[PDB]
Amino acid sequence: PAYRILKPWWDVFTDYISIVMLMIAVFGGTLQVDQDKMICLPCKWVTKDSCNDSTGPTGIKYDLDRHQYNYVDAVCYENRLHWFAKYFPYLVLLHTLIFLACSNFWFKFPRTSSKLEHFVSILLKCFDSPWTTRALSEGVLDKKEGEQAKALFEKVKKFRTHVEEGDIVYRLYMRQTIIKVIKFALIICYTVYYVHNIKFDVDCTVDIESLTGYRTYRCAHPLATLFKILASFYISLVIFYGLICMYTLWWMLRRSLKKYSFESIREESSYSDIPDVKNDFAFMLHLIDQYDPLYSKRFAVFLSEVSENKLRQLNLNNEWTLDK
Amino acid sequence: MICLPCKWVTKDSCNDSTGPTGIKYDLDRHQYNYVDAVCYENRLHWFAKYFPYLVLLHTLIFLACSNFWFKFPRTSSKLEHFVSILLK
Amino acid sequence: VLDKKEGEQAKALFEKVKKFRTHVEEGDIVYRLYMRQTIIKVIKFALIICYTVYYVHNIKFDVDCTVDIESLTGYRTYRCAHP
Amino acid sequence: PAYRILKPWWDVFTDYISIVMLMIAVFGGTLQVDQDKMICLPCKWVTKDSCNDSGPTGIKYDLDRHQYNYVDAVCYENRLHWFAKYFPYLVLLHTLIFLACSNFWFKFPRTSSKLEHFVSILLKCFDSPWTTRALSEGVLDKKEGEQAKALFEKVKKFRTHVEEGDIVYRLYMRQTIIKVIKFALIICYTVYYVHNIKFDVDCTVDIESLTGYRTYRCAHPLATLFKILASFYISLVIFYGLICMYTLWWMLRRSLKKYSFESIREESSYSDIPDVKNDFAFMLHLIDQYDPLYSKRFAVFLSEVSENKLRQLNLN
Amino acid sequence: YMRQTIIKVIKFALIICYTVYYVHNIKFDVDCTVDIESLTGYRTYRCAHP
Amino acid sequence: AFRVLKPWWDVFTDYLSVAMLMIGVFGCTLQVMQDKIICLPKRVQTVEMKGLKTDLDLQQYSFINQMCYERALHWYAKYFPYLVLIHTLVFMLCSNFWFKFPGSSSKIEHFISILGKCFDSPWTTRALSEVSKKEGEQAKALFEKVKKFRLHVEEGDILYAMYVRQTVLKVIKFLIIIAYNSALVSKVQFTVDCNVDIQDMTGYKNFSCNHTMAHLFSKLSFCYLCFVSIYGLTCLYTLYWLFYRSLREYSFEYVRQETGIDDIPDVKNDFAFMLHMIDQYDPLYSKRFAVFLSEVSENKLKQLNLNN
């Protein structure tokens, strides 16, 4: 809601990619819970535990009950079907949960959440303040408007001392991005290595000859091709997520986000006493610039003490009236 | 995919050839299920299997194209600012 | 006539409109994005129509399958109904 | 919401009974859709095309699963009573008719507009500080005085506008009559046909050409569960009908088209409040059946003496 | 409020009494003697309620 | 504003509880429909292999499945999701043990209102600038409110006791959960042997059965065990932070190291504990609220008001 200003394009992209990946997880999970079977048929003639594959055609009579077939299906599904095909939706869901937790950790960690909410509030109510418009445009001001303007000035003054000293938000965002990129690397290694094990035709040799009469059964996993295309789509989405996360990492590495220069603002505007901000304040100002630079353009008005002197003069011209 | 064997095969083709009596195929239910699974996997066309998923993917692509205007932060901020100013 | 408050807010809205025009009239990122979305939608429509019209005839009821499972079933060719 | 004021205890009781019957209708419909079948076994011994039924070994019928399914479907469609099959759909239809009768008062634009106007200025008269000033029996604000005068004029205009026609009272009476006749028909036909929901059903459907047997004996799985649901619906309909007869007796007890303000004019200072008639009288009877405080706070606007006190106090 | 509390207490008492009385009848192995020998061929069956 | 009083361990345990709820719901919906056993009788009646004929109907097979699901399957493998649900509901209900009792809730609301009001008060910034009108009257009113809060909270210590009881309850429940889950996690297995006596019906006595959802239940049990272990490490850290530092005493000497005012009294018991809570949220509120406590600050404010 109010944090949409603090989410750049990469965060929005990753959030929507995570939503689609979670949809894939839910769909695959429902399919694997309901219809994930393994139709197994015994091999009639075997040579050293391997099927030999040796007047109209007549069906092969296996002399097996329905329950013996179900037992064979259960044994070969448990034993011979690869673990990736069985636990692909659950692993996907776990990875999506990890990605979503990493993306939204700094929105839930109280130490960074307090600073983030304070920043969002004192930048938005800064943004809609009329003093910003009147200052950037450069006699009489409303009493409520003047009191509010000085109140936000003092609030920005204390917020600067409260945030500039620490770098907890910047370090947390660094750690979240690094964890996300290494998670993407691990996923795109293991999923790509084990995606070839989702096959339709699986041979099972489970040694239940004392309960069924056959040793080797040529099973068939029905949701193998569908799971294969779901895995390919998941790999594509993880590739996109990883490319976006590497772009975020490169963005955070090239430019020192623990410093922020208002040189562009102080040259276009008359106010040239806006100081260079550093640490976490610089980091969220960079994030706001990634969202919309004009928010920080208006926010730099309250950072200059020349604006403070002008506001104090105007308020004094109002507090002390000719009548009193 | 309800699959029944062609008892009269003529060079990989169904020949399609005293009360009537049903043809005994001597197939178990599980053999029938295996035949269904294999002929659904290998011989059913990919369109008949993945038409709704392709339609869903195309609809999601269309929705993404429609709403990427409002989801991209620069253009979203510009449109929000324009809407606020024009409403005011 | 006009009140002091109405005049003040109208002047403030005038400056807001001027600043919004200065910040927006510089580029055409919104117009370019809307163009690009329209072209992508038209191209997607063309591709969808071509492939769907070409492959819609393959959704048939009676399908003859020849999968070579003679060692497991005993028959080679089967006729299937896709309900 | 805004319409809860014009809903007396009978109305809210009928609404809760209605949603309860809607719930049991949905449950019965889901049951009919999913688990409503009937297991039919052929009678191996027959007598004049009837079920004779005269280490034990199970009887061999030489019937496939599909012949059993065909026998089930044919006997279910033919020799199962229509009540035992379409009871939940009938309950759903009756509940929908009852809810439509209850809510058509709120949906018809003329009556809905009249109800909205009444509720709106009743809320405004509640918010009027001169209501408190009159009920207590000093200094008047200009805005407060203008609002009070406008509310007085609005009350007079609306009283003139609605006291001519009683379409709302007539619609409410028609809804009550339709509901009580519906309840009578529902209870009659449901009491008549509830005994036809049986467990053991002997079906003679003449499918000997296909199955080979003539008569079959069927067990309806959801027979006694449907019977319990039917008895529950009968109890709910009886309660709804008793409430509806009480509401009709409330109509016929006294003329709701004639409200007398005698008690309020005796208790309050203003004793010149006229005896209003027709739709205004019915609308005031409804809020009296919800809360007499609404009439107490609103009767001060009707009286001309309070207007006489209004013009004197406004002048001061 | 007094009437509602009284009705709730009485309903609790009745619920506890009947439920404690009849909770032992929910068993797994039940023997049924339904006399469908004309249709099935057996009279007594032992069942199992999932 | 209740989220301010929640440190990282409290929200971490809450999100762990939501994860446990998801695991329990998933296990329950698996056990409702997917949970079934498949049983085959033992010693039943280029090599051409032939299947063994058990001579059993489908109904006899279902009967065997039920007898072996009831009398052979371990109770843990059947009632693990419900145990998870019950235990995590008890965890969730006890997660806000120190938040729900009305006296403690009133103390929480009073303290957070006071701390926020002096946070918004510019007299804090004025006094910090001094050391290193209307708003003066508001500051004096807030100061006498702070003194009333001192007379209303500091003498009691019920909040600390409730927190320590909640933490001890969480730790002992986590010990119980780890103990029984680790003891019974070996019972969830795929192949089971069922020796029910239904020979008079089916003809066989010894059966070999497969719990189809046993691998999935084992993975769910291990995931729940991992979540329980993480929850218990969080609660053990909470207890360690509770005990290794005496939280009945809050010292303002760290403020004294850079702030010249030394008349600041050290608060105890409930005040000390919940100021430690606000320090765990962020120490800035505590080191800023220090200036509102001492009395010489009130005397200086009174003198400033008199001079003005």
CA angle F29, F34, F35 (to 5 degrees): 95
Q: What is the three-class DSSP state of F49? A: coil
Q: Please state, in angstroms and rounded to a whole number, the distance separating the CA atoms of residues A162 and F51.
A: 79
Phi, psi of D145 (to 5 degrees): -65, -40
The answer to whether F211 touches F192, Cβ cutoff 8 Å, is: yes
Chains sharing 3 or more CB pairs under 8 A with chain E: D, F
Q: What is the three-class DSSP state of F249? A: strand
Give chain A positions within 8 Å (CB) of C16: 133
Interface of F with E (CB under 8 A): 63, 66-67, 70, 201
Check the CA dihedral B83-B85-C2-C3 and report its sign: positive
What would the two tokens of residue F258 be?
């850079």
Q: Are A44 and F42 an interchain contact pair (Cβ–Cβ within 8 Å)? A: no
Q: Please state, in angstroms and rounded to a whole number, the distance separating the CA atoms of residues F271 and F111.
A: 9
Concatenated DSSP letters for A224-248?
GHHHHHHHHHHHHHHHHHHHHHHHH
User: Tokens 């026609």 — which residue?
Assistant: D165
Chains sharing 3 or more CB pairs under 8 A with chain C: A, B
Q: Does E3 touch chain F (CB under 8 A)?
A: no
Give the gap in angstroms from C-alpha B60 to the nearest C-alpha of chain A: 10
Give the gap in angstroms from C-alpha F192 to the nearest C-alpha of chain E: 19
User: Tokens 């969002």 — which residue?
Assistant: A120
Q: Does C70 touch chain A (CB under 8 A)?
A: yes
Q: Which residues pair with C63 in a beta bridge?
A: C80
Q: Which residues pair with F192 in a beta bridge?
A: F209
Question: Closest-CA residue in chain E for F200?
Answer: E46
Q: Are F67 and E46 an interchain contact pair (Cβ–Cβ within 8 Å)? A: no
Give the gap in angstroms from C-alpha E50 to the nearest C-alpha of chain F: 7
Pairing outcome for strands B2-5 and C62-66? unpaired
Q: Are B30 and A41 an interchain contact pair (Cβ–Cβ within 8 Å)? A: yes
Question: Closest-CA residue in chain E for F71?
Answer: E28
Check the CA dihedral D7-D13-D19-D21 and report its sign: negative
Instruction: Judge residue F1's burial from the number of C-beta atoms within 10 Å of its C-beta, 0-12 exposed, 13-18 middle, 19 or more buried.
Output: exposed
The answer to whether F67 touches F201, Cβ cutoff 8 Å, is: no
Question: Closest-CA residue in chain B for A295?
Answer: B77
Of D233, D227, D226, nearest in space to D36 by CA: D226
Instruction: Judge residue E48's burial from the number of C-beta atoms within 10 Å of its C-beta, 0-12 exposed, 13-18 middle, 19 or more buried.
Output: middle
User: Which amino acid is present at D24?
Assistant: I
User: Which amino acid is present at A78?
Assistant: E
Neighbours of A141 (CB within 10 A): 18
Of A235, A226, A229, A191, nearest in space to A35 by CA: A226
Q: What is the three-class DSSP state of F194? A: strand
CA angle C63, C64, C66 (to 5 degrees): 135
- Counting every residue written for chain D, the total comes to 316
Q: Please state, in angstroms and rounded to a whole number, the distance separating the CA atoms of residues A157 and F129.
A: 12
Phi, psi of A172 (to 5 degrees): -65, -40
Integer CA distances (angstroms), E5 to C70, D12, D16, in order: 75, 22, 21
Give the gap in angstroms from C-alpha A211 to the nearest C-alpha of chain F: 7
The answer to whether A299 touches A123, Cβ cutoff 8 Å, is: yes
Q: Which residues pair with F207 in a beta bridge?
A: F41, F194
Of E22, E19, E25, E33, nearest in space to E49 by CA: E25
Q: Which residues pair with D40 in a beta bridge?
A: D218
> Which among A68, A111, A215 has CB closest to F282?
A111
Phi, psi of F77 (to 5 degrees): -65, -20
Q: Burial code of A27-60, b = ≥16 C-beta within 10 A, e = fewer?
A: ebbebbbeebbbbbbbbbebeeeebeeeeebebb
Of F237, F256, F291, F268, nearest in space to F115 by CA: F291
Give chain B positions within 8 Å (CB) of A200: 41
- Cα radius of gyration (chain C): 32
Instruction: Judge residue D261's burial from the number of C-beta atoms within 10 Å of its C-beta, 0-12 exposed, 13-18 middle, 19 or more buried.
Output: buried
CA angle E16, E20, E24 (to 5 degrees): 155
Q: Are A292 and B73 an interchain contact pair (Cβ–Cβ within 8 Å)? A: yes
Residue B14 is classified by DSSP as: B
Q: Are E28 and F201 an interchain contact pair (Cβ–Cβ within 8 Å)? A: no
Q: Are E41 and D56 an interchain contact pair (Cβ–Cβ within 8 Å)? A: yes
Q: Please state, in angstroms and rounded to a whole number, the distance separating the CA atoms of residues A234 and A29.
A: 14
What would the two tokens of residue F297 be?
């600050």
Q: Are A60 and C72 an interchain contact pair (Cβ–Cβ within 8 Å)? A: yes
Q: Does B39 touch chain C (CB under 8 A)?
A: yes
Phi, psi of C20 (to 5 degrees): -65, -40
Helix (H) or strand (E) holding F48: strand F47-48
Give the ranges where chain E is alpha helix by DSSP (H).
Answer: 2-22
- Best to test chain F binding among A154, A158, A215 (most F CBs inside 10 Å): A158
Integer CA distances (angstroms), A284 to A119, A173, B76, D94, F102, in order: 8, 10, 19, 62, 39
What would the two tokens of residue B43 be?
């011989």
- The residues, ordered by sequence, that sit 6+ positions from A13 with a Cβ below 8 Å of its Cβ are A240, A244
Starting at the edge strand that comes first in sequence, how are the strands of the sheet with F191-194 ordered? Answer: F37-41, F207-211, F191-194
Question: Closest-CA residue in chain F for E47?
Answer: F63
Starting at the edge strand that comes first in sequence, how are the strands of the sheet with D200-204 ordered? Answer: D39-42, D215-219, D200-204
DSSP strands (E only) in B1-88 = 2-5
Give the gap in angstroms from C-alpha A127 to the nearest C-alpha of chain C: 12
Q: Please state, in angstroms and rounded to a whole number, the distance separating the CA atoms of residues D162 and D168.
A: 10
Give chain B positions within 8 Å (CB) of C59: 45, 47-48, 51
End-to-end distance of chain E based on CA atoms, in angstroms? 43
End-to-end distance of chain C based on CA atoms, in angstroms? 76
- The residues, ordered by sequence, that sit 6+ positions from D65 with a Cβ below 8 Å of its Cβ are none
- Best to test chain A binding among B7, B39, B41 (most A CBs inside 10 Å): B41
Residue A184's Cβ-side half-sphere holds a number of Cα atoms within 13 Å equal to: 24
Q: Does D217 touch chain E (CB under 8 A)?
A: yes
Q: Does C2 touch chain B (CB under 8 A)?
A: no
User: Which amino acid is present at F106?
Assistant: S
Q: Burial code of D104-113, b = ≥16 C-beta within 10 A, e = fewer?
A: bbeeeeebee
The answer to whether D50 touches D215, Cβ cutoff 8 Å, is: yes
Question: Closest-CA residue in chain F for E29?
Answer: F67
The answer to whether F68 touches F207, Cβ cutoff 8 Å, is: yes
Residue F189 is classified by DSSP as: -
The answer to whether D286 touches D257, Cβ cutoff 8 Å, is: no
Give chain B positions within 8 Å (CB) of A287: none
Phi-psi region of A216 (alpha: psi -120 to 50; beta: other; left: phi over 0): beta
Q: Does A110 touch chain F (CB under 8 A)?
A: yes
Q: Please state, in angstroms and rounded to a whole number, the distance separating the CA atoms of residues D31 and F113.
A: 55
Check the CA dihedral F25-F26-F27-F31 and report its sign: positive
Check the CA dihedral A63-A66-A72-A77 and report its sign: positive
Q: Please state, in angstroms and rounded to a whole number, the distance separating the CA atoms of residues F53 and F44.
A: 8
Query: CA dihedral defined by A287, A288, A291, A296, rounded to 10 degrees?
Result: -150
Q: Are F281 and A75 an interchain contact pair (Cβ–Cβ within 8 Å)? A: no
- The residues, ordered by sequence, that sit 6+ positions from B2 with a Cβ below 8 Å of its Cβ are B36, C80, C81, C83
Concatenated DSSP letters for D235-277?
HHHHHHHHHHHHHHHHHHHS-TTB---HHHHHHSS-------B
Long-range contacts of D214-217 (CB under 8 A, 24+ apart): D214/D46, D214/D49, D215/D42, D215/D43, D215/D46, D215/D49, D215/D50, D215/D51, D216/D40, D216/D41, D216/D42, D216/D43, D216/D51, D216/D71, D216/D75, D217/D40, D217/D41, D217/D43, D217/D51, D217/D53, D217/E39
Q: In the structure, do chain F and chain C come into contact, i.e. share 3 or more CB pairs under 8 Å?
A: no
Q: Does D45 touch chain E (CB under 8 A)?
A: yes
What would the two tokens of residue A261 be?
């220069």
Give the gap in angstroms from C-alpha B6 to the nearest C-alpha of chain C: 5
DSSP strands (E only) in chain D = 39-42, 200-204, 215-219
What would the two tokens of residue F159 be?
């909040």
Phi, psi of D284 (to 5 degrees): -70, -35
Q: Please state, in angstroms and rounded to a whole number, the distance separating the CA atoms of residues A79 and A77.
A: 6
Chain-centroid distance, C-alpha D234: 15
The answer to whether D121 touches D151, Cβ cutoff 8 Å, is: yes
User: Tokens 């901020």 — which residue?
Assistant: B77
The answer to whether B28 touches A64, Cβ cutoff 8 Å, is: yes
Helix (H) or strand (E) holding A219: strand A216-220
Q: Are A44 and F7 an interchain contact pair (Cβ–Cβ within 8 Å)? A: no
What would the two tokens of residue A321 be?
């009236």
Check the CA dihedral D67-D73-D78-D79 and report its sign: positive
Phi, psi of D160 (to 5 degrees): -65, -35
Neighbours of D311 (CB within 10 A): 12
Give chain E positions within 8 Å (CB) of F201: 46
Q: In the structure, do chain D and chain E come into contact, i.e. share 3 or more CB pairs under 8 Å?
A: yes
Residue D70's Cβ-side half-sphere holds a number of Cα atoms within 13 Å equal to: 14
- The residues, ordered by sequence, that sit 6+ positions from A64 with a Cβ below 8 Å of its Cβ are A42, A72, A212, A213, B28, B30, F51
Q: Are D45 and E38 an interchain contact pair (Cβ–Cβ within 8 Å)? A: yes
- The residues, ordered by sequence, that sit 6+ positions from A309 with a Cβ below 8 Å of its Cβ are none
Resolution attained, angstroms: 3.2
Q: Which residues pair with F39 in a beta bridge?
A: F209
Taking each continuous run of H as one helix and of E as one strand, the counts in chain D are 12, 3
Give the gap in angstroms from C-alpha E49 to the nearest C-alpha of chain F: 9
Neighbours of F177 (CB within 10 A): 21
Q: Please state, in angstroms and rounded to a whole number, the distance separating the CA atoms of residues A231 and A191.
A: 8
- The residues, ordered by sequence, that sit 6+ positions from D205 with a Cβ below 8 Å of its Cβ are D71, D74, D75, D78, D79, D216
The answer to whether B35 touches B3, Cβ cutoff 8 Å, is: yes
> Which among E38, E40, E43 has CB closest to D54?
E38
